[PDB]
Amino acid sequence: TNTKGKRRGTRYMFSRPFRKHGVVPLATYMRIYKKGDIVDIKGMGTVQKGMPHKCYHGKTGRVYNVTQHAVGIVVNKQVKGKILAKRINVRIEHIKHSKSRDSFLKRVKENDQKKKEAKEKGTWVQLKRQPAPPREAHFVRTNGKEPELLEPIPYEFMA
Amino acid sequence: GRRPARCYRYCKNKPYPKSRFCRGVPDAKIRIFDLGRKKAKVDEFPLCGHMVSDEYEQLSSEALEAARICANKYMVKSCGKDGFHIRVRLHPFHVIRINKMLQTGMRGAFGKPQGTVARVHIGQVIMSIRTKLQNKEHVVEALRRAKFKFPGRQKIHISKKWGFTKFNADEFEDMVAEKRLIPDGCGVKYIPNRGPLDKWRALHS
Amino acid sequence: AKSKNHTTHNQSRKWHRNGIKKPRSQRYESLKGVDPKFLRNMRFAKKHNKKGLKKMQA
Amino acid sequence: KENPMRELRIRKLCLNICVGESGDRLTRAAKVLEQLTGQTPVFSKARYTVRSFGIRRNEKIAVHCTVRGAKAEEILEKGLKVREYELRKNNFSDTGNFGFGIQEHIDLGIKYDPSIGIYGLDFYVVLGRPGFSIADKKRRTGCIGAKHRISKEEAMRWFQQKYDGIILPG
Amino acid sequence: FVKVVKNKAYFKRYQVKFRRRREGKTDYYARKRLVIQDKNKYNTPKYRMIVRVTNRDIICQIAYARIEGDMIVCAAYAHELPKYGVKVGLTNYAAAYCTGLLLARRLLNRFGMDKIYEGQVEVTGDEYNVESIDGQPGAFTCYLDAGLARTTTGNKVFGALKGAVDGGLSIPHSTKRFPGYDSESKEFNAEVHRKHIMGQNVADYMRYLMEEDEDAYKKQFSQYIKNNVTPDMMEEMYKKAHAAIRENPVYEKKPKREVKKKRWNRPKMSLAQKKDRVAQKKASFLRAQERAA
RNA sequence: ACCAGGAUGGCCUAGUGGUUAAGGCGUUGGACUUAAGAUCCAAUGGACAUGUGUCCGCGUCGGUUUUCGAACCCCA
RNA sequence: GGGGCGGACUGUCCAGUGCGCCCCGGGCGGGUCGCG
RNA sequence: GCUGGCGCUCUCCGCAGUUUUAUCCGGUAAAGCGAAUGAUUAGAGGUCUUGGGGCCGAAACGAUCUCAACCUAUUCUCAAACUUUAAAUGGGUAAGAAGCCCGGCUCGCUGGUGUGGAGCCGGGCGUGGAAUGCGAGU
RNA sequence: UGGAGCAGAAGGGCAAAAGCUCGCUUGAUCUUGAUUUUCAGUACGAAUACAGACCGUGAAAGCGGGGCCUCACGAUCCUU
RNA sequence: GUCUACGGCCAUACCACCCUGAACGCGCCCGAUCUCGUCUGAUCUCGGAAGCUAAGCAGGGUCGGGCCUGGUUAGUACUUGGAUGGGAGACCGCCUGGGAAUACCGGGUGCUGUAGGCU
Ligand SMILES: [Mg+2]
Ligand SMILES: [Mg+2]
Ligand SMILES: [Mg+2]
Ligand SMILES: [Mg+2]
Ligand SMILES: [Mg+2]
Ligand SMILES: [Mg+2]
Ligand SMILES: [Mg+2]
Ligand SMILES: [Mg+2]
Ligand SMILES: [Mg+2]
Ligand SMILES: [Mg+2]
Ligand SMILES: [Mg+2]
Ligand SMILES: [Mg+2]
Ligand SMILES: [Mg+2]
């Protein structure tokens, strides 16, 4: 059997990237985390305090509590056949703001900005994003040149 | 003494080199990987022939020495004592194990290091010989004789390259002439158009 | 008499028979684990929201 | 014309007496360095134990001092008056420093007393131009630059044009 | 010979430090503990009194750190002390006090807190700390940024600190680093600190030199004679400077004018030019052989 | 094979906690005796079995080698 | 591509390379609009 | 945990062993060793940075050759307990009414600041804001 | 650029440091709750953010409730 | 055109050598009475302004090394899913989608925020 150690198998996971060791850049610490904000967990190995467990690395959660140097996050964690909503405490170094929700915020701002105008102009805009449609019927111009003829190559033993 | 090579023909295990975790490994039977005129220049031995593997198999160090003795003997007989250069292009790094049983059974059945065996892929060169152009049938018969020391199927392929180099034999001589390859012992050194200009002045003085 | 040591073989089927349900998120989630100083001040704010009730109706 | 700041100057004269064993025989060498330099020197400890030398770790086996100002100039003229203004070409280092050794400190002109004895010592001269302290400052430390460094062949020229010294070959 | 250390693999594996650390201008260990706010304070600015001694100038800045960079709220230099009267000695302890006081009064006048929070109007040099008056806005609170300056007793960063806290800024400090604090008795002497604030350590040096070596006095205080500053006027000259600072601490911008767009550096050389240059070098080197033979 | 050990002057044995190389016999030189043993006065020598790690420093502690001896190898 | 003015810069033969403003000769490339 | 039974609360918005659009996560396959660590084959080019020697000298980096290490560029072959790179498959999150947008109170937390945060109230906005499928919850 | 050291196994981490040398110390103290880890989502152990004291240290920002992290340990009954 | 003070991103910024640097600045530089700390005013700390861009620093240069970004490598290697595909096997081919990495060959060589100067 294995060991139940806390950092078992985290040799590359908690390690720093190549030529990215040493001083933590200080705008990591300057980012505002509100209640309810959606963030991504990624354990930095420079700071050994507040370190999330390896099952939270690469998980995304919702911040429920904010303290001086750390936040509490609600994280979905699958425990065999049930998913638990975790209440974990993790420092500011091991988290980063998720960008998955701030494109939905861009979509709702351009969707309420397309509801509130064009209503006075009477036309109808689209808000539900359709998937990638079949390609429309189009003409392909071969102006002058004939399409180049391809043949399979003879087999030559390379080396 | 040692088992027949059919026990360790296939690359079944993960690679297992000798390191600080594998100790008590006996030295390989093959030690010398180059025979013939090692000191021959790059323009003296233009014609290169390879013995190329066709299987993902494992060649023993004993076989790698037997084939180089067979090929060496035919090339010293046919091309004369120094008219060739043989490079064995596999070095046996994968250690094979043995669980010797004279009783414990399969309890604690992790082997002690039995021997050293090289791993070859489909299309990887096993042996290479460079020589003069007129010794081509002697190269082909030398590798064809050395074939029988090896398990599995090997092809003999006269390479497009110039000896033991990465450059083609047709483009080789005029790109030596244009001072793109400077001959440096066995092979060549490529001179790109990218260094400081003092190297270009030293080359074009 | 040796035996099988460990497996996770039929487990993914058993987890999916009644489903792998996401945990039940409802609005107004509980305040367990929030900062006690912040929560004590929040309870003072909730205790005195009735104070400025006339300004609200005005 | 060269600038006034390319003029070579003696940064420091570093004197040590390496006795090799601790006690009274090292305190009298400290008194030698005191009467030579005008200041109390500091002892240096052995880094590890070598039985062939008779040293133990962290045992005070040498004493040394650094002098600057005009006092380094005066003690260096003392040292070269002992050495008769002759240095060998190999006494100059690759970075533009030089040095020598005195077999007897009372040859410098320190009066002998029975309470101390006679100690040989070791002279090292570190030269510099103005601006060599930027590698030692705290706020904006840098390297001194290639055209500002002292070559061996420049420190030899400074020595021969500053003390009329004769650089012995070999 | 020697295995060369700065080979190709060395620069492949080299991780350069931060630009400010490589230059030497920033202690990032200090900056992490100094500029970062607690995260349950939520864009509440954390203010700094950056105090920087150059060779000819003391700089006192009030800043707060943002993600996109530090945001300077107020700034005061010593080169503007000729406006208030301190013509000579723009990098002494008294000038440090003057620009700390000028930074404090400029910032409080910008925030509207000039008539409140006046500090010590008479400088006596002891421990003083402003306090928040109820009903009025609370006092401005910042923390000192000495940078890499070795905070020993008598450092001019603490002169700037004393100028700021006598102007009315709430900065946490002790009197252990003010000049006049005796290290052996562990007591602080406000009168000695008042002499250092009013420059009665340097007028003592001019009186010291005018009796020992008049020529060394000439070469040590040369612009003092040119500006006609004597040992006897130093206290009231700094007093009039402090009174003028609290009279008018607002800063007027030096007006922008037009210039003829003159470039003083070499422009970066183009790809066509750097190909042509090496082609010309090759042609010249080859002609220096086909003309030699 | 598994466990437990053991390798030091020419032979037989000491030797730690980590700094001291020990003893007996032997060898060598001089006395005693006509001479030799015995006896008396002295002297030398150690691949500390190897390399590695710990430590300032190892014969000494800790893992791996190379020669040896001891115990066990049972129920059918 | 050519012309004009302003400059910068380079080559171990006067010779050459960009950049700024203006003009011409256009060829070209597809987009947008109009006409048949 | 899987199972059955008994139900119950609603339905007649929600959810998914699925994709898409976004967005993070990873160090396996492959690849690399003219890149760190480790292993390792071959020549070549150099000098004193040392040594082993022939030969010329008391000898001399004085002349003279080599041969070794050493250094500089190449080259052959590699790694589960190496790695600059680095997949495919895969794991989180988001795809709205519990959402946005105004106004106004409370706070003993925060503190230049009707500052910041948080909690309360009042109002406004339904094109239900990817595809597909299915009644769910307890 | 760490090829050293950080008590040790190994891995990760670390350069005006987390290493080395000084200065001062005792946050290796008292007291609730919450959380992570193994997990049944139980304990122990270990750990993490907080809060309430009382302190240390520094000029201050801050940092500290043991050791840079991953290991170094113990229920009921009884005794003290 | 550029610098100073504080920075964010942390080499397109580093490294080696060379050339230029107007004005302010940054510095080097002068000194040790005071503050302070050293064997040593070299550092640190303080008090200054005779001299100078020599150094740092800034801007350029190198058929520069590194770094960054492309092409090639290469639809190669590998890979999701499929077959009563092949082969004694080893392994390989096809269908279905996904898809690298060196060597080799191009291009680039710090942007930028706040406050305050100089032309
Ligand atoms: Mg196997
Ligand atoms: Mg079982
Ligand atoms: Mg500090
Ligand atoms: Mg792994
Ligand atoms: Mg592989
Ligand atoms: Mg506390
Ligand atoms: Mg510690
Ligand atoms: Mg019991
Ligand atoms: Mg000085
Ligand atoms: Mg300069
Ligand atoms: Mg210059
Ligand atoms: Mg380049
Ligand atoms: Mg700017």
PDB file of C-alpha atoms (C1' of nucleotides) in Angstrom, chain I residues 31-56:
ATOM      1  C1'   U I  31      -8.922  30.119  25.756  1.00  0.00           C
ATOM      2  C1'   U I  32     -13.342  29.106  22.411  1.00  0.00           C
ATOM      3  C1'   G I  33     -15.259  27.491  18.078  1.00  0.00           C
ATOM      4  C1'   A I  34     -14.516  26.378  12.276  1.00  0.00           C
ATOM      5  C1'   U I  35     -11.570  23.573   8.556  1.00  0.00           C
ATOM      6  C1'   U I  36      -8.011  20.095   5.994  1.00  0.00           C
ATOM      7  C1'   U I  37      -5.657  15.411   5.904  1.00  0.00           C
ATOM      8  C1'   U I  38      -6.839   9.386   6.916  1.00  0.00           C
ATOM      9  C1'   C I  39     -12.050   9.585   6.519  1.00  0.00           C
ATOM     10  C1'   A I  40     -17.398   6.162   7.590  1.00  0.00           C
ATOM     11  C1'   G I  41     -16.988  11.935   6.025  1.00  0.00           C
ATOM     12  C1'   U I  42     -15.629   8.955  13.170  1.00  0.00           C
ATOM     13  C1'   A I  43     -11.725   9.670  16.621  1.00  0.00           C
ATOM     14  C1'   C I  44      -6.306  10.129  17.512  1.00  0.00           C
ATOM     15  C1'   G I  45      -2.071  12.185  15.431  1.00  0.00           C
ATOM     16  C1'   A I  46      -0.532  16.017  12.244  1.00  0.00           C
ATOM     17  C1'   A I  47      -1.888  20.482   9.866  1.00  0.00           C
ATOM     18  C1'   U I  48      -4.605  25.033   8.194  1.00  0.00           C
ATOM     19  C1'   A I  49      -6.943  29.744   8.392  1.00  0.00           C
ATOM     20  C1'   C I  50      -9.565  32.818  12.289  1.00  0.00           C
ATOM     21  C1'   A I  51     -11.090  35.062  16.890  1.00  0.00           C
ATOM     22  C1'   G I  52     -10.266  36.520  22.361  1.00  0.00           C
ATOM     23  C1'   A I  53      -6.103  37.487  25.877  1.00  0.00           C
ATOM     24  C1'   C I  54      -1.167  38.266  27.369  1.00  0.00           C
ATOM     25  C1'   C I  55       3.721  38.841  25.362  1.00  0.00           C
ATOM     26  C1'   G I  56       8.291  38.809  22.223  1.00  0.00           C
TER      27        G I  56
END
